[PDB]
Design a protein around this ligand. Structure first.
Ligand code: NA
Lengths: 10, 380, 380, 10
């Protein structure tokens, strides 16, 4: 369950 | 001086209900509701240091004054009163509430620790209430609900003159809604973060234009408060002091595949296939030619698959999603058709509302006011 | 031989939902599909309750199969408005209906108990009457398995006369009615699990009750219930029901008649402030009923109502929920209360058109087909 | 909270 590539955050 | 008034039941019960919404679950004085009779009417207010709500209602004030009474009990009582005028009278430590043949005697709460409402910041701009409710409802669905990551539990509000952009994310989906408002003060350039659960509740309660108060000049946000002003209603919300993640870079400029299909048909078919998905974990989407094949399943519970015709351009693609994140997004488009923008099975999918309406690609991102960006799940 | 049939989706989903309604919480999980000469039989069983329904269906191959109950029900509910083809292969059952396709695992039919035979038919009653009378008495049944005898509805049959009774030690509900006997007059009494029977009754042709005939009544230890296409059984309780008839007062020292809706609404209003909803106070005197509740720590409430009252003034208290349960089970415009002392049972019965007034009494009890007998609580 | 005078039962 990968996250959105939010930076930071994932 | 002892407060005494008569009020129309519906006006009173509505206003009390509205205030009691933003009232806290459990210092015990904070769940009190404040009744103040003035030269102009009745003010009904509630405050809990985070959120405040004040509503002004017409009333016949025989005797001016104020009284604090338990907010829940008052709300319950007012909902159940008969079709008669309501008369409220403070007599000592008790507040008396009479309506037809019904008579209630309630204890008065203590004011000596009851905090004054905060003043609203200066006005910033005005939005029509139906637009405000729609936009806030749209982005709020993506907000995080875990207080241990506070930045995620806000709605990001960015202001650029006449343009307003709302965003929210919980790391799995991102919702971004752009809109136009009419500024009241000077032209403004700022960004703020507002608790999403609060703001969505206020918007969902309704208004008939909404005045937003964030301040003006370069002092926007300095009170640390979002004020919302409506006809006869004033509320404040403590802003979130947390850095929001940089979301704009996640919106792809183009796609290697796009897909267009009816929202209602897709949503129904998703829900149907997901019935066999283990712990509702994932639904599989296979795009190819003019066909979308949904599938889900589990070893010991069973399998499901369903075909839907689709408008699909690009190379065949199989991508999987959390069914609920997916229908959450579909449900928040408010359009007949949806357009999906894809790249790979491992990268975010773009959901935008399509309107009534080729080649090999890549395909330029559509320009829309609203977008819901959804992260895929890994195929096993 | 492998089962395979087409069936109308509405008929199929309706049947499954009816059978799945009577399904155990945790192999008996499955429901049994069976294709025959006449059509398709759908059934479920858990050693306590059996339920079988026959539906029209183009059988294309005879056979039967045990499939997961809750799953089959959810799937059938979600199907589109197209016909349903079912086909059995190996340990999988396939279900297609338009674009959607399902493949469920089959369950081990080997260990699945056969449905018990329904007893011989005893009598027949109209569906709407049956549903009303069960609904009326079920509200008084005990719900606690440590006292099994109180968890049943008592069914006493004497020729064409049927008496229904239930109690939880705090209220007692008795409903008399008349039916048609199908196998000569019989004289017996059984005790049927309240919850089950109330569910059966809540589910328009006619209701045939089967308990056997002659002196063999209750000897199967089963209540059979049959309507068009529907067959069900319920294990009887062999617990000993208390003697209830002697509790019905022959006369009252005071009687009150009042509108049911007006009283019910006033009770629910006043009890808003009652501690734990433990009690509401009723003061009758002259031409007025005064309800009251609460204490000065949370709040007090009272309300006056016009009442048709005869006898000496009386103040009596009740559990407000038990009181509105009784009121709501009367199904009449007005209620007549029969009292003696504040600490003895009160009779609630539908008012007739004679009810209302004058006299000092004592007042003979009325003959009614329905009575709800409520124990007061002690005033403090 | 007395019971109905059920016999037995109260
Ligand atoms: Na009396």
């Amino acid at each position: 369950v990968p996250t959105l590539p939010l930076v930071p955050x994932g | 001086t002892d407060l005494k008034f008569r009020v129309v039941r519906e006006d009173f019960a509505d206003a009390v209900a509205w205030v009691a919404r933003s009232l806290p679950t459990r210092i015990p004085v904070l769940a009190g509701v404040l009744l103040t009779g003035t030269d102009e009417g009745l003010t009904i207010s509630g405050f809990d240091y985070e959120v405040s709500a004040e509503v002004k209602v017409s009333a016949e004030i025989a005797s001016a004054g104020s009284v604090l009474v338990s907010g829940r009990l008052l709300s319950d009582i007012t909902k159940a009163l008969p079709a008669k005028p309501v008369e409220v009278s403070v007599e000592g430590t008790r507040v008396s509430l009479t309506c037809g043949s019904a008579r209630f005697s309630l204890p008065t709460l203590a004011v000596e620790d009851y905090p004054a409402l905060p003043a609203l910041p200066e006005e910033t701009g005005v939005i029509a209430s139906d637009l405000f409710a729609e936009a806030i409802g749209q982005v709020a669905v993506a907000a995080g609900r875990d207080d241990t990551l506070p930045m995620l539990t806000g709605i990001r509000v960015e202001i650029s003159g006449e343009s307003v952009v709302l965003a929210a994310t919980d790391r799995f989906r991102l919702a971004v809604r752009e809109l136009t408002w009419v500024t009241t003060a000077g032209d403004v350039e700022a960004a703020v973060l507002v608790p999403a659960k609060t703001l969505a509740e206020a918007a969902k309660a309704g208004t008939n234009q909404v005045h937003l108060a964030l301040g003006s000049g370069a002092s926007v946000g300095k009170d640390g408060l979002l004020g919302i002003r409506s006809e006869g209603k004033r509320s404040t919300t403590r802003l979130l002091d947390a850095e929001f993640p940089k979301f704009r870079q996640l919106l792809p400029a183009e796609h290697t595949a796009v897909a267009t299909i009816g929202v209602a048909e897709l949503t129904e078919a998703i829900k149907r296939v997901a019935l066999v998905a283990d712990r509702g974990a994932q639904i599989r989407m296979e795009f190819s030619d003019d066909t979308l094949k949904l599938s889900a399943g589990a070893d010991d519970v069973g399998r499901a698959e369903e075909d839907l015709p689709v408008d699909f351009a690009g190379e065949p693609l199989t991508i999987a999603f959390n069914p609920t994140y997916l229908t959450d997004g579909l449900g928040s488009l408010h359009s007949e058709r949806v357009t999906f923008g894809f790249t790979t099975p491992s990268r975010p999918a773009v959901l935008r509302p399509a309107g009534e309406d080729g080649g090999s690609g890549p395909f330029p991102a559509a320009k829309t006011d609203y977008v819901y960006l959804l992260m895929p799940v890994r195929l096993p």
